[PDB]
A and B are shown apart, each in its own frame.
Chain A
């Protein structure tokens, strides 16, 4: 169906649609509905897109890695590697970490692109808002510095998630039954770690300077 790319795309499109939908509804109820493009961007970059992309990446890539490493552990393939004079951790876990570091930036770029596209499409097609007003309030109140810091957060989070899932899959036990339990535990830990990382990074970055100006 596309693999990690398709799942990431669907989940980020859903998150952007939710932002646009609820945002436009609430602002139209209040009356100040031209700020939707301003509201959506700060919703995606600050809170929604990093966390949502992290959970989808956790699920797909981390659960796949945990299952693969557990299957290798049960099938005595790690023992086969150790017998043939190979550092099992270097061959498996370090390779997974390098692959994740290489792959995370394109994945999060696609996630950000699709979240922005979904929010804009929902606001300016289904809700029939003019594209000019949306683009103005989007490009005026969005700072590329926020996007760069968000990319750094996502890279750190992906490294942590890959480490956690490789740990849970590498030391699996109990045959084929234990692999599923390892996957579940790894998923719980990954959710907690992703949310904590995003919270700490946002607290550190904008604790003093909110990096947003509207009034005088």
Chain B
């Protein structure tokens, strides 16, 4: 999952969710230079039981759990889900990251 910024309180071990239920966890975060601009790249380990349930066009958001808690990756089904299913070879992006308290 690629995004503009990883988000604070987002560390390896953060829950990845579909429709609000955990389906996996965050493995690692890295900085990747895309067109001379650093971006955040997140690697997610997901149980393949739910992969056939996640649409290809699933919206991704780096949302916040509570005011004190950490962040989690949230997958949701779009308005017009695709027939193709999410897999390791599908490039996906995060639609937004919740604003920090700073």
Interface residues of A (CB under 8 A from B): 215-216
Contact = CB atoms under 8 A, between A and B. Distances in A.
Interface of B: 20, 65-66, 69, 72
A102 to B, nearest CB: 41
B18 to A, nearest CB: 14
Contacts, number: 8
Contacts of A215: 65-66, 69
Enumerate the 6 nearest inter-chain pairs by beta-carbon distance, A residue then B residue, closest first.
Answer: A216-B65, A215-B65, A215-B69, A215-B66, A216-B66, A216-B20
Contacts of B20: 216
A215 B72 CA distance: 11
Main secondary structure of the interface of B (DSSP, over half): loop
8 contacts: A215-B65, A215-B66, A215-B69, A216-B20, A216-B65, A216-B66, A216-B69, A216-B72
A216 B20 CA distance: 8
A45 B27 CA distance: 29
A193 B79 CA distance: 58
Contacts of B66: 215-216
A216 B63 CA distance: 11
A207 to B, nearest CB: 12
Contacts of B69: 215-216
Nearest to A216: B65
B73 to A, nearest CB: 13
A189 B65 CA distance: 46
A216 B65 CA distance: 6
Nearest to B13: A210
A60 to B, nearest CB: 41
B74 to A, nearest CB: 10
A95 B29 CA distance: 57
Nearest to B74: A216
Contacts of A216: 20, 65-66, 69, 72
